[PDB]
Design a protein around this motif. Structure first.
Motif, PDB file in Angstrom:
ATOM      1  N   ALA A   1      -1.632  -1.211  10.568  1.00 24.88           N
ATOM      2  CA  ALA A   1      -0.545  -1.239   9.534  1.00 24.88           C
ATOM      3  C   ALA A   1      -0.533   0.067   8.735  1.00 24.88           C
ATOM      4  O   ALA A   1      -1.573   0.629   8.446  1.00 24.88           O
ATOM      5  CB  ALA A   1      -0.890  -2.409   8.602  1.00 24.88           C
ATOM      6  N   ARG A   2       0.630   0.546   8.371  1.00 24.89           N
ATOM      7  CA  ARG A   2       0.707   1.803   7.579  1.00 24.89           C
ATOM      8  C   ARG A   2       0.220   1.537   6.147  1.00 24.89           C
ATOM      9  O   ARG A   2       0.975   1.623   5.198  1.00 24.89           O
ATOM     10  CB  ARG A   2       2.189   2.209   7.602  1.00 24.89           C
ATOM     11  CG  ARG A   2       3.051   1.141   6.914  1.00 24.89           C
ATOM     12  CD  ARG A   2       4.433   1.095   7.571  1.00 24.89           C
ATOM     13  NE  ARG A   2       4.321   0.061   8.641  1.00 24.89           N
ATOM     14  CZ  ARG A   2       5.382  -0.568   9.108  1.00 24.89           C
ATOM     15  NH1 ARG A   2       6.592  -0.296   8.677  1.00 24.89           N
ATOM     16  NH2 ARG A   2       5.227  -1.476  10.032  1.00 24.89           N
ATOM     17  N   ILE A   3      -1.037   1.196   5.994  1.00 23.34           N
ATOM     18  CA  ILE A   3      -1.578   0.899   4.637  1.00 23.34           C
ATOM     19  C   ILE A   3      -2.815   1.750   4.335  1.00 23.34           C
ATOM     20  O   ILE A   3      -2.993   2.219   3.225  1.00 23.34           O
ATOM     21  CB  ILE A   3      -1.941  -0.595   4.669  1.00 23.34           C
ATOM     22  CG1 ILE A   3      -2.507  -1.021   3.304  1.00 23.34           C
ATOM     23  CG2 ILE A   3      -2.976  -0.874   5.762  1.00 23.34           C
ATOM     24  CD1 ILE A   3      -2.820  -2.525   3.305  1.00 23.34           C
ATOM     25  N   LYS A   4      -3.681   1.921   5.295  1.00 30.27           N
ATOM     26  CA  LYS A   4      -4.924   2.707   5.044  1.00 30.27           C
ATOM     27  C   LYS A   4      -5.552   3.223   6.343  1.00 30.27           C
ATOM     28  O   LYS A   4      -6.684   3.675   6.337  1.00 30.27           O
ATOM     29  CB  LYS A   4      -5.861   1.684   4.390  1.00 30.27           C
ATOM     30  CG  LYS A   4      -7.121   2.388   3.866  1.00 30.27           C
ATOM     31  CD  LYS A   4      -8.332   1.996   4.719  1.00 30.27           C
ATOM     32  CE  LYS A   4      -9.465   2.999   4.492  1.00 30.27           C
ATOM     33  NZ  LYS A   4     -10.335   2.874   5.694  1.00 30.27           N
TER      34      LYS A   4
ATOM     35  N   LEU B   1      -2.276  -7.434   3.616  1.00 32.56           N
ATOM     36  CA  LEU B   1      -0.906  -7.138   3.105  1.00 32.56           C
ATOM     37  C   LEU B   1      -0.779  -7.667   1.673  1.00 32.56           C
ATOM     38  O   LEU B   1      -0.042  -7.132   0.868  1.00 32.56           O
ATOM     39  CB  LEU B   1       0.049  -7.886   4.051  1.00 32.56           C
ATOM     40  CG  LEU B   1       1.013  -6.913   4.753  1.00 32.56           C
ATOM     41  CD1 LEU B   1       0.240  -5.836   5.543  1.00 32.56           C
ATOM     42  CD2 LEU B   1       1.885  -7.723   5.718  1.00 32.56           C
ATOM     43  N   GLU B   2      -1.513  -8.709   1.343  1.00 35.19           N
ATOM     44  CA  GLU B   2      -1.456  -9.261  -0.050  1.00 35.19           C
ATOM     45  C   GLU B   2      -1.849  -8.157  -1.031  1.00 35.19           C
ATOM     46  O   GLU B   2      -1.298  -8.034  -2.108  1.00 35.19           O
ATOM     47  CB  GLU B   2      -2.475 -10.402  -0.081  1.00 35.19           C
ATOM     48  CG  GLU B   2      -2.316 -11.194  -1.379  1.00 35.19           C
ATOM     49  CD  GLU B   2      -3.252 -10.622  -2.446  1.00 35.19           C
ATOM     50  OE1 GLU B   2      -2.840  -9.703  -3.135  1.00 35.19           O
ATOM     51  OE2 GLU B   2      -4.364 -11.112  -2.555  1.00 35.19           O
ATOM     52  N   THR B   3      -2.780  -7.329  -0.630  1.00 37.81           N
ATOM     53  CA  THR B   3      -3.205  -6.188  -1.493  1.00 37.81           C
ATOM     54  C   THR B   3      -2.464  -4.925  -1.037  1.00 37.81           C
ATOM     55  O   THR B   3      -3.042  -3.872  -0.855  1.00 37.81           O
ATOM     56  CB  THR B   3      -4.721  -6.053  -1.291  1.00 37.81           C
ATOM     57  OG1 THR B   3      -5.205  -4.971  -2.075  1.00 37.81           O
ATOM     58  CG2 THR B   3      -5.040  -5.792   0.185  1.00 37.81           C
ATOM     59  N   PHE B   4      -1.183  -5.056  -0.836  1.00 36.21           N
ATOM     60  CA  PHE B   4      -0.344  -3.916  -0.369  1.00 36.21           C
ATOM     61  C   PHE B   4       0.781  -3.674  -1.370  1.00 36.21           C
ATOM     62  O   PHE B   4       1.038  -2.561  -1.787  1.00 36.21           O
ATOM     63  CB  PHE B   4       0.215  -4.416   0.966  1.00 36.21           C
ATOM     64  CG  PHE B   4       0.609  -3.285   1.889  1.00 36.21           C
ATOM     65  CD1 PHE B   4       1.196  -2.113   1.398  1.00 36.21           C
ATOM     66  CD2 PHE B   4       0.421  -3.446   3.260  1.00 36.21           C
ATOM     67  CE1 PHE B   4       1.597  -1.107   2.289  1.00 36.21           C
ATOM     68  CE2 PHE B   4       0.811  -2.451   4.148  1.00 36.21           C
ATOM     69  CZ  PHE B   4       1.405  -1.278   3.667  1.00 36.21           C
ATOM     70  N   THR B   5       1.441  -4.723  -1.752  1.00 33.06           N
ATOM     71  CA  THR B   5       2.562  -4.603  -2.731  1.00 33.06           C
ATOM     72  C   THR B   5       2.265  -5.428  -3.987  1.00 33.06           C
ATOM     73  O   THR B   5       3.166  -5.853  -4.685  1.00 33.06           O
ATOM     74  CB  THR B   5       3.785  -5.164  -2.003  1.00 33.06           C
ATOM     75  OG1 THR B   5       3.417  -6.342  -1.297  1.00 33.06           O
ATOM     76  CG2 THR B   5       4.316  -4.121  -1.018  1.00 33.06           C
ATOM     77  N   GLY B   6       1.007  -5.654  -4.282  1.00 32.42           N
ATOM     78  CA  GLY B   6       0.648  -6.449  -5.494  1.00 32.42           C
ATOM     79  C   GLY B   6       1.207  -7.867  -5.363  1.00 32.42           C
ATOM     80  O   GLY B   6       1.653  -8.459  -6.328  1.00 32.42           O
ATOM     81  N   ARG B   7       1.185  -8.416  -4.174  1.00 30.78           N
ATOM     82  CA  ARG B   7       1.716  -9.800  -3.970  1.00 30.78           C
ATOM     83  C   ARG B   7       0.931 -10.800  -4.823  1.00 30.78           C
ATOM     84  O   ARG B   7       1.450 -11.211  -5.848  1.00 30.78           O
ATOM     85  CB  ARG B   7       1.516 -10.094  -2.482  1.00 30.78           C
ATOM     86  CG  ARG B   7       2.354 -11.310  -2.083  1.00 30.78           C
ATOM     87  CD  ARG B   7       1.522 -12.584  -2.252  1.00 30.78           C
ATOM     88  NE  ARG B   7       1.968 -13.493  -1.149  1.00 30.78           N
ATOM     89  CZ  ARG B   7       1.277 -14.567  -0.823  1.00 30.78           C
ATOM     90  NH1 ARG B   7       0.167 -14.889  -1.449  1.00 30.78           N
ATOM     91  NH2 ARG B   7       1.703 -15.331   0.146  1.00 30.78           N
TER      92      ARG B   7
END
Length: 28
Positions: free
Chosen positions: A5-8, A22-28
């Motif tokens: 994923a384009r996250i880290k 992903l939960e720690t991706f957009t502050g979900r």
């Protein structure tokens, strides 16, 4: 070809794990 994923550039053995990551991706 493990996930990536384009996250880290952490890569993920499964997309099911990406969800939690992903939960720690957009502050979900």
């Amino acid at each position: 070809k493990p996930y990536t994923a384009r996250i880290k550039g952490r890569t993920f053995s499964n997309e099911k794990e990406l969800r939690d990551f992903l939960e720690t991706f957009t502050g979900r």
